[PDB]
């Protein structure tokens, strides 16, 4: 059943699994019409599909053309997410197909189950974890490829860069969730923390800066401080 | 007007005949039920005074043979049996009637309740759901599981209701996943009506039979089947107008006949709220919505 704090190590075992987050699939700006009514204008979106063990990210870019002439878009977005994940699984060799898919939002369960009826051995699971994958569009290189897309496109990334050369997949996932949680709580502050020192750059083939082991400990500390400050504010405590 | 004689009543038992019921005392001179209306299926049913566990009973149609009940002290139940000797049977019944040892099927002339509950139920369909081909009558009880329940364990004692599963390849056409999940019209009209039941009369017959097994025996799998058949129609955007009008009548008499005290266990909150207030057919079940709102407003 549900993925929680109790069964967290299961993410880093040798059973292939993917997280699917649909929170950036259907994106809009809300605006006033000439007549003073309100209207939405869709922008490019993305499915965030991640192997938490390998760091392999299957970023499917959802171009605004997919919404043209469609009704009830927030509902369609769940089914289009389910279609695209099902298409990805069928495109993978058998030995690369996941044994489990964990959806970050419970509303994805029925759409994904129905699209994966052909795969009765792949378990579709919810999670009780509050994962910050919505902040994926705060990673500059991922935001850039989504906004530039002129057509439906799949782009492959490693969201852990080369971290697994030095740390385990448990530690790499913990670093990722902390960076994304910071970016979600205070984007400006988080980005300031990550770039402030101009001598540490992002490699052309990476998403995050090339921090030494010591510099990551300082960064990780600065992100925890940012998250607690913001929390005191949010709740007056 | 047909008769189901009883050899004897050696154990204290509540006896049901359709929607009626009578208490019989241990060794009471009871020799059966007369004046049973020809033209309908009927169900005779039993609950022992000493074990109000296992309600059990027999579906039968008096046009298909001469049936009687006899207690079996070994298996410890009232059994239905067929008498093949017509002259022995007529002579048994005539004796019991002359001695006035039979209860009279107590139908009010104005009262269409039983017709309304069994309109589409046919013995030949019952005998395909309840398989025991050496008998012309069908045994059901509280505990019997459905083919569907067994999949999710003695196949001979199963209820072979048509399997309905909204998240099955049968229900969902490849490439029409969202369309077919949110609008069950293809599953209702092509797979179930044209494909399996052949017509709406067979579909309604199974729906009515599942309800009656749920109500008379508290059979849980039957209750699941009744709700699933209602939900498949209410969740379809495109249903023939005659089917919606007839469904409204069927459900009205089912809700009217349900004992008031069993609404907690026999009615599924989610299905009824969805069917009356959210579904495509939310506005198509006027009679059913009015009786449900006036008799069970707590459920909704």
Curated annotation (Swiss-Prot), chain A:
Variant or mutagenesis effect after changing residue 104 to A: Reduced growth at 30 degrees Celsius. Strongly reduced growth at 16 degrees Celsius
Subcellular location: Nucleus
Positions of the UniProt region annotated as RNase H homology domain: 7-237
Impact upon substituting residue 21 to N: Reduced growth at 30 degrees Celsius. Strongly reduced growth at 16 degrees Celsius
Result, substituting residue 21 to A: Alters protein folding. Severely impaired growth. Strongly reduced growth at 35 degrees Celsius
Coiled-coil features, chain-numbered ranges: none
Source superkingdom: Eukaryota
Domain notes: The MPN (JAB/Mov34) domain has structural similarity with deubiquitinating enzymes, but lacks the residues that would bind the catalytic metal ion.
Described purpose of this protein according to its UniProt entry: Functions as a scaffold that mediates the ordered assembly of spliceosomal proteins and snRNAs. Required for association of BRR2 with the spliceosomal U5 snRNP, and the subsequent assembly of the U4/U6-U5 tri-snRNP complex. Functions as a scaffold that positions spliceosomal U2, U5 and U6 snRNAs at splice sites on pre-mRNA substrates, so that splicing can occur. Interacts with both the 5' and the 3' splice site, as well as the branch region. Has a role in branch site-3' splice site selection. Associates with the branch site-3' splice 3'-exon region. Also has a role in cell cycle.
Note: Present with 468 molecules/cell in log phase SD medium.
Assembly with partners or alone: Component of the U4/U6-U5 tri-snRNP complex composed of the U4, U6 and U5 snRNAs and at least PRP3, PRP4, PRP6, PRP8, PRP18, PRP31, PRP38, SNU13, SNU23, SNU66, SNU114, SPP381, SMB1, SMD1, SMD2, SMD3, SMX2, SMX3, LSM2, LSM3, LSM4, LSM5, LSM6, LSM7, LSM8, BRR2 and DIB1.
Name recorded for this polypeptide: Pre-mRNA-splicing factor 8
Lineage: Eukaryota, Fungi, Dikarya, Ascomycota, Saccharomycotina
Gene: PRP8
Range within the parent protein: 1836 to 2069 of 2413
From Swiss-Prot, chain B:
Entry comment on modification after translation: Phosphorylated on serine and tyrosine residues.
UniProt keyword list: Cytoplasm, mRNA processing, mRNA splicing, Nucleus, Phosphoprotein
Alphabetical list of InterPro entries matching this protein: AAR2 (IPR007946), AAR2_C (IPR033648), AAR2_C_sf (IPR038514), Aar2_N (IPR033647), AAR2_N_sf (IPR038516)
Residues bearing the modification Phosphothreonine: 257
Primary location recorded for the protein, binned into one broad class: cytoplasm
Gene3D superfamilies the record matches: 2.60.34.20, Aar2, C-terminal domain-like (1.25.40.550)
UniProt cross-references to CDD domains, sorted A to Z: Aar2_C (cd13778), Aar2_N (cd13777)
Leucine-zipper as annotated region, ranges: 244-265
GO CC terms in record: cytoplasm; U5 snRNP
Sites of Phosphoserine modification: 236
Subcellular location as annotated: Cytoplasm; Nucleus
Gene Ontology biological-process entries: spliceosomal snRNP assembly; spliceosomal tri-snRNP complex assembly
Superkingdom per UniProt: Eukaryota
Record family assignment: Belongs to the AAR2 family.
Quaternary structure, from the entry: Heterodimer. Interacts with PRP8 (via RNase H homology domain and MPN domain), competing with BRR2 for the same binding site. Component of a U5 snRNP complex that contains at least the U5 snRNA, PRP8, SNU114, AAR2, SMB1, SMD1, SMD2, SMD3, SME1, SMX2 and SMX3, but is not a component of the U4/U6-U5 tri-snRNP complex.
Other comments on record: Present with 7330 molecules/cell in log phase SD medium.
Role this protein plays: Component of the U5 snRNP complex that is required for spliceosome assembly and for pre-mRNA splicing. Involved in splicing pre-mRNA of the A1 cistron and other genes that are important for cell growth.
Name listed for the protein in its UniProt record: A1 cistron-splicing factor AAR2
Organism from which the protein derives: Saccharomyces cerevisiae (strain ATCC 204508 / S288c)
Gene: AAR2
């Amino acid at each position: 059943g549900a993925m929680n704090s109790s069964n967290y190590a299961e993410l880093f075992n040798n059973d292939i699994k993917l997280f699917v987050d649909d929170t950036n699939v259907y994106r809009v700006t809300v605006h006033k019409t000439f007549e003073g009514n309100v209207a939405t204008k869709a922008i490019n979106g993305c499915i965030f599909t991640l192997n938490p063990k390998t760091g392999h990210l299957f970023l499917k870019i959802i171009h605004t053309s997919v919404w043209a002439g469609q009704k009830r878009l927030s509902q369609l977005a769940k089914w289009k997410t389910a279609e695209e994940v099902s298409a990805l699984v069928r495109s993978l060799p058998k030995e690369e197909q996941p044994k489990q898919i964990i959806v970050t939002r419970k509303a994805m369960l029925d759409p994904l189950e129905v699209h994966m009826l052909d795969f009765p051995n792949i378990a579709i699971r919810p999670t009780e974890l509050r994962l910050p994958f919505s902040a994926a569009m705060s990673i500059d290189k991922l935001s850039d490829v989504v906004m530039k897309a002129t057509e439906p496109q799949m782009v492959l990334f490693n969201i852990y860069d080369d971290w697994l050369d030095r740390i385990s997949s448990y530690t790499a996932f913990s670093r990722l969730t902390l960076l994304l949680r910071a970016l979600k709580t205070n984007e400006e502050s988080a980005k300031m923390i990550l770039l402030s020192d101009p001598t540490i750059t992002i490699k052309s083939y990476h998403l995050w800066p090339s921090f030494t082991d010591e510099q990551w400990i300082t960064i990780e500390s600065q992100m925890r401080d940012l998250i607690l400050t913001e929390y005191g504010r949010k709740y007056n405590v | 007007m047909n008769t189901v004689p009883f050899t004897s009543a050696p154990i204290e038992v509540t006896i049901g005949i359709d929607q009626y019921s009578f208490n019989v005392k241990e060794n009471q001179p009871f020799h059966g039920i007369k004046d049973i209306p020809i033209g309908h299926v009927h169900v005779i049913h039993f609950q022992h005074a000493d074990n109000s566990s296992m309600r059990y009973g027999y579906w039968f149609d008096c046009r298909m043979g001469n049936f009687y009940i006899q207690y079996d002290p070994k298996d410890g139940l009232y059994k239905m049996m067929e008498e093949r000797d017509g002259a022995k049977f007529e002579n048994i019944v005539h004796n019991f009637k002359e001695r006035q040892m039979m209860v009279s099927y107590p139908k009010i002339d104005e009262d269409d309740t039983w017709y309304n509950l069994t309109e589409f139920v046919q013995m030949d369909k019952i005998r395909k759901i309840v398989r025991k081909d050496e008998n012309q009558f069908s045994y059901v009880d509280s505990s019997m599981t459905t083919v569907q329940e067994n999949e999710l364990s003695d196949p001979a004692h199963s209820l072979n209701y048509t399997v309905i599963n909204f998240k099955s390849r049968e229900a969902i056409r490849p490439g029409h996943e969202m369309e077919d999940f949110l609008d069950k019209s293809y599953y209702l009209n092509t797979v179930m009506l044209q494909g399996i039941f052949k017509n709406s009369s067979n579909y309604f017959g199974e729906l009515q039979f599942a309800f009656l097994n749920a109500m008379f025996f508290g059979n849980y799998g039957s209750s699941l089947q009744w709700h699933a058949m209602i939900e498949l129609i209410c969740s379809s955007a495109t249903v023939p107008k005659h089917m919606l009008d007839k469904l409204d009548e069927i459900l009205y008499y089912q809700i009217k006949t349900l004992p008031e005290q069993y609404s907690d266990i026999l009615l599924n909150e989610r299905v009824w709220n969805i069917c009356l207030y959210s579904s495509f057919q939310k506005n198509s079940l006027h009679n059913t919505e009015k009786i449900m709102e006036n008799k069970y407003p707590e459920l909704l």
